[PDB]
Amino acid sequence: DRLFQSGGGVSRPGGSLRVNCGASGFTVRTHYMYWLRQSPGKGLEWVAFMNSGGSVSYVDSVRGRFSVSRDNPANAMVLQMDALKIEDTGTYYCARELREAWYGDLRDYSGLDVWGRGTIVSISSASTKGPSVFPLAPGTAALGCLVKDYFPEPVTVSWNSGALTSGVHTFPAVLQSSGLYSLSSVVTVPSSSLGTQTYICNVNHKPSNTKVDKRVEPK
Amino acid sequence: SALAQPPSVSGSPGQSVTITCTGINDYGAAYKFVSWYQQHPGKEPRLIMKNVKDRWSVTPNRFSGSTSGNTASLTISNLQSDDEAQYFCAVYAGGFTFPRLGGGTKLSVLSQPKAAPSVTLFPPSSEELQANKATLVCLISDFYPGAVTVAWKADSSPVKAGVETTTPSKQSNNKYAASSYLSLTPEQWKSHRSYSCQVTHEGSTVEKTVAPT
């Protein structure tokens, strides 16, 4: 018993996408089926439930926007997603649940034993965009550069055209709900060097032909 | 609502760990069917275990479940590197429309000693404020294992909107790094007394606070 998925993709807010879920080894139309989704780095949440008789229940936040239909010739079910919102971004899974119930009297329950591999859905108003670079003002002191709201990856960061490498930590970027990235680079320096050694972060974002050299000064 | 699971547990290779799942009887007295799911990073979940303690397919004798009515447990013995994964409990009974899901536990197999996070929190820059934007920057580094919870407060009350937090990723020194950003309006920033970034790691917390100044 196998589930396989296709579809999904990228859409602006308010647009539409579709995720397909087909089975082998059993028919969707005679089994209890589920749609789930997972926002990145977060947990599983429900989307929709289709019982063996074909009635569909939706979580409140998608009812009226999402609909699930059977595609019996393809031995599949389809998640039609309209009026997409930023909150709908995630990986979407279909699953089959095994249970033993006579009438509405559950006798046994196994759980979701068959899962599709997942389909990526990205709701974003993002296109190629250069970053805004902001100074993060500073024994030792930590100063840095905030590299905000760029797309797509990657940006590169150096300090003082690469003459300063010790103490540098450039953090992996965050993919924001906007669909844009942001990252920070921070360097640890001797506090006695502040206001006598110039600190400049060199930010390059080749996808947008943007280069920024920001002097980071003590407050 | 949701079942209560620890966000993370960790154990040493060879040892055993127990992931708990509490709240099973918050919604009726009907018999509860408890299932457990394992999900490796980048992969889809897999059914492990049904009916508290009944192993599913080729789940080894290492995975066993027990139950205390309100708390179900999954115990993994002879812990090994393949066990690093997220674990979800689920509870179904007659009458549920959806099974209840727990929030997930990240299971870490310690291959080195635990390391507490270093935390740096930067206030919005006046340059960014001048652009009618405000970003609080919370940088988290040098921790092990790679599992943190990040919460933000405005004054003393929790904030959920405007928070963006990375999944931890391995540094070159083999510990982990993460970033959390709180986006605010300048009016929100200036109108509060302080904002705080709180980092929880293996049951311990570091909190850094900044105030408009």
Residue numbers in the entry:
A (entry chain H): 2 to 82, 82A, 82B, 82C, 83 to 100, 100A, 100B, 100C, ...
B (entry chain L): 2 to 9, 11 to 27, 27A, 27B, 27C, 28 to 95, 95A, 95B, ...
What did the original publication write about this model?
The HIV-1 envelope (Env) undergoes conformational changes during infection. Donor B cell receptor (BCR) repertoires identified two bNAb lineages, M4008_N1 and M1214_N1, that class-switched to immunoglobulin G (IgG) and IgA.
Using single-B-cell RT-PCR, we recovered four bNAbs, M1214_N1, M1214_N2, a clonal variant M1214_N2.2, and M1214_N3, and one non-neutralizing mAb, M1214_b4. For M4008_N1 and M1214_N1, the BCR repertoire identified clonally related γ and corresponding light-chain transcripts, but not μ transcripts, as expected. To assess the physiological relevance of the IgA bNAb members and help rule out possible sequencing or PCR artifacts, we purified the IgA fraction from M1214 plasma and found that the M1214 plasma IgA indeed neutralized the same four HIV-1 Env strains as did the M1214_N1.2 IgA1 bNAb.
